[PDB]
């Protein structure tokens, strides 16, 4: 009745042993990049699936069952994917259970969000009615409003009660609290994670002082409600007559210089309004982008902007020669430091010598890629003679092998470099190596690198930043860092607009645009606008109804602490 993992070493896992109870709803949590993903998927799921299919770096796994993953890793349509040939009767019910009743059967699978695709996959799997299976789920709350949280949990417990084991990788409060058993992975992330910090009932995890997760679940840590909301400064964008998909001829004003959250249940029209209409219309007017925007009459207030930038979880680059140091430009500052050493000068090495993208200093066998690791440079990317030049006893490959946090100390006497490294540290990437290849960064890591570069950029207040569900993949502690960074962009007078369901984010927003009231044909209207406090009071707003008790909970936690 237990899955026994012994000596798990995948990625950053530190040769760990873990017991997971079978026939239970088990949640694995931790920071983004803690190793929770390596444990659930690269280790447990991979081994369980491999063993059945016969018909990962680990010593032994005992008590495995044949495993099925439910993630986004899987022109067809909704109808073809669920084999069903607006939401024969059996399947349709499962689509409703996973919160997808607003989808049409004709919908291109290629145009579903990742959260939608994941939930179609979940529906198909519930349809199988299998027992004795080990299900491994990645973050099933993605794309789901707090209102649908209870039904998701009930759906998971129903699969469990059929006689299956559920391993759920999550950061969502309610899911963790509803778990049979909860495992906190990683003190930190990467090199700083990969350990079992705490394991037991949610209640036992809350009472464990070592557990970062337990400290947030118990209230010892929380994201505060901001003292004041920023007020509009007279600059508005206005979307006029938005009609794309289910949007009911919507007009709405967006205040610049504020942190704006677009909210609403799944299928309410959030992504249509923001991605299909606003982003595409702005990108076409501002950057001459090709993509045809969704149906709308007009967008006013374009005189206020120079640029629109969507920050998503797509890669920062396509080669190993791209990394966090090259993306932020801290790489070029480092090359300048090496070029300024006595030994570089004596040898006549200019900055170009310390670039792995040009002939001279790079390893010529791998053209500076490092890669199987190149037999010549062993992945260091530079030839032997270049590597003899050191700054403070370190060569350029050793520098690129430093974590952001160690590089911060190492470059303490170079302000320009410090300032760039601080942005990466502040976004939550202190653990990451400067030279980590773009090809190996997770989605969340890539979004955070991009945010770090934006934070550094000189601002004129004329940029609109758009982020579609940026809390995807993030622990509440990661979210605190994300919010710190996003609010700092707004302080420059730029505008941050997020599509979110996460109430930790929403409660810190200056301004909310709530769509609905429901999804599909029953959505596409503006339900409420205003501050979190204003939306909290609107009875017809599902977002408000769930937001109100969060504002109250976290105001009370603030007032309890002032009682110091």
């Amino acid at each position: 009745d237990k899955i026994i993992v012994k000596g798990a070493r995948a990625h950053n896992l530190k040769n760990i042993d873990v017991e997971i109870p079978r026939g239970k709803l088990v949640v694995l949590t931790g920071l983004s990049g803690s190793g929770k993903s390596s444990l659930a998927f690269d280790t447990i799921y991979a081994e369980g699936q491999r063993r059945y299919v016969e018909s990962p770096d680990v010593d032994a796994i005992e008590g495995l069952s044949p495993a099925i993953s439910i993630d986004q890793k899987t022109r067809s349509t909704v109808g073809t994917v669920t084999e069903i040939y607006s939401v024969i009767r059996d399947r349709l019910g499962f689509l409703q259970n996973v919160g997808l009743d607003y989808l049409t059967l004709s919908r291109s699978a290629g145009t579903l969000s990742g959260g939608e695709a994941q939930r179609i996959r979940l529906a198909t799997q519930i349809g199988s009615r299998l027992t004795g299976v080990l299900y491994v789920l990645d973050e099933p709350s993605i794309g789901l409003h707090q209102r649908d949280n209870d039904r998701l949990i009930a759906t998971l417990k129903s699969m469990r009660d059929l006689g299956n084991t559920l391993i759920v990788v999550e950061h969502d409060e309610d899911t963790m609290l509803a778990a049979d058993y909860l495992i906190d992975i990683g003190p930190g992330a990467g090199i700083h994670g990969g350990e079992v910090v705490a394991a037991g009932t949610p209640e036992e995890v809350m009472n464990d002082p070592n557990s970062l997760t337990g400290q947030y679940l118990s209230g010892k840590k929380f994201i505060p409600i901001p003292a004041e909301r920023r007020r509009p400064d007279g600059r508005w964008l206005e979307v006029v007559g938005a009609r794309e998909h289910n949007l009911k001829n919507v007009s709405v004003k967006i205040p610049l210089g504020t942190f704006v959250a677009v909210t609403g249940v799944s299928g309410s029209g959030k992504s249509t309004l923001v991605n299909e209409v606003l982003y595409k219309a702005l990108a076409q007017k501002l950057h001459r982008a090709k993509a045809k925007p969704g149906e709308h009459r007009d967008i006013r207030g374009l005189e206020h902007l120079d640029k629109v930038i969507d920050i998503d979880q797509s890669p920062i680059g396509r080669t190993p020669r791209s990394n966090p140091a090259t993306y932020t430009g801290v790489f070029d500052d480092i090359r300048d430091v090496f070029a300024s050493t006595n030994e570089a000068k004596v040898r006549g090495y200019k900055k170009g010598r310390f670039s792995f993208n040009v002939k001279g200093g790079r390893c010529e066998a791998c053209h500076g890629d490092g890669i199987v690791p190149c037999e010549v440079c062993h992945g260091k990317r530079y030839n032997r003679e270049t590597l003899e030049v050191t700054y403070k006893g370190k060569n350029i490959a050793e520098v690129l092998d430093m974590t952001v946090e160690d590089a911060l100390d190492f470059f303490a006497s170079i302000p320009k470099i410090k300032r760039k490294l601080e942005t990466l540290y502040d976004v939550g990437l202190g653990y990451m190596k400067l030279g980590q290849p773009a090809t190996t960064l997770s989605g969340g890591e890539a979004q955070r690198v991009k945010l770090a570069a934006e934070l550094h950029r000189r601002s004129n207040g004329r940029t609109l930043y758009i982020l579609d569900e940026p809390t995807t993949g993030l622990h509440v502690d990661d979210i605190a860092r994300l919010l710190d960074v996003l609010h700092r962009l707004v302080d420059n007078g730029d505008t941050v607009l997020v599509i979110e369901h996460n109430l930790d984010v929403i409660k810190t927003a200056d301004y909310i645009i709530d769509l609905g009231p429901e999804g599909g044909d029953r959505g596409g209207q503006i339900v409420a606008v205003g501050t979190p406090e204003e939306v909290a009071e609107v009875k017809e707003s599902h977002t408000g109804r769930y937001l109100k008790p969060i504002l109250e909970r976290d105001r009370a936690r603030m007032q309890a602490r002032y009682e110091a």
Copy 2:
């Protein structure tokens, strides 16, 4: 905790509902062709595997788990198949557990018996250490001596106790008695089977008067011990200096005009002596067969034989135009009957008109194949005008659509046809359609068709029949029929030699040649020869040790019945 099958219709299954308890050793039994195979494999295993792989004619199946089959349906070697690169340490132990410790790691997988291949597959599967799996096993006792029966049962119960369900298709007494739950399928076979006759504990099945299986388990029915053993009549074959594989320079005499059983544990040298040496040497001397015989000095007594015939479970033909009626030649007798009808005469139809193998009377669209069923003849194989000729109101396609037993009644006034049909009835194929295509016959069916044709053949007493494990696939009631037929061949003065582990067969033998004492390097010697009673007394003979209590059990049952 139950697998619920509702409305199963595969092959001969008669729209049945069945409950199978989960986490148990469940045995499905019945006659050969009862439908037990259609239930376990075509229905339960197929659905369980299909459902997992997404990641059969049946209404619904509830409580399925991902399913793994253990049969013979799966140049590589023992080493490569178990991935192991005489019986790293983990796997070797499993090969011992399944009774394969005499195998070498270099052995060609292509030269393993079906029973050996099945047990390698079983070993690999135990190696997986999976839980929550539904295992479906076809006849795992194939090739296994009674001595290894207890260990096989312990091995199965160990897989169950790991937390799996075992559905075992079997006819073996001890396996049935050791079952948690036992299901008796089919009153008869084919059209006469496909129903759940009895289901419960083995004890409950024994106490059910409807159950053919229970009647044999309880002793109400049994195969008797013959009154007298046939004595040699002066004709002997002698194998001289057999050295192939593990055979220790063996010389042994075989008495013709008797029923001979070659016995011994797995790997003792049975198939080497009989198939590799005896059969190949005789086939080369008598029929100029090409295959090089195994190493031996000589074979004496060839003056006594005209032919050697191996009867196995390979197909009777390769096309649909081959069937039990064509193989036995009863087809040609039927064509004669049609050619003799008034209407055939009036029309000038000769016997050739009623052959689907020649132009004129056959359906020309499918060249007489019947096949998707041909859109023209609808599978009847003949054109419209031929089908207008009837005998006793039936046309030739209707005759071919008759079961052997119905055809027996229908042709009651044609002795020649009756005599051929009786052979098929006597081998146990009363249920089978005369025209059933060779391409659709099971292994056991094909062997039985061949035996029927042999039984009909005029004999000079100069044939040696060899059968390698002919009880494969057979219920003890099927075995009684098989033995009746084989003993009738011996009555003609021909010789029947079987390789067997089945003690129901062995106890009826006139003469036993027992190899061993163990398998592999520890086998290859003649342990004992003589009557069953003589071998029963030999302490060093594993065959004798298990045979003795069977002779006693069944002699006592005979004496109890005489107390009528």
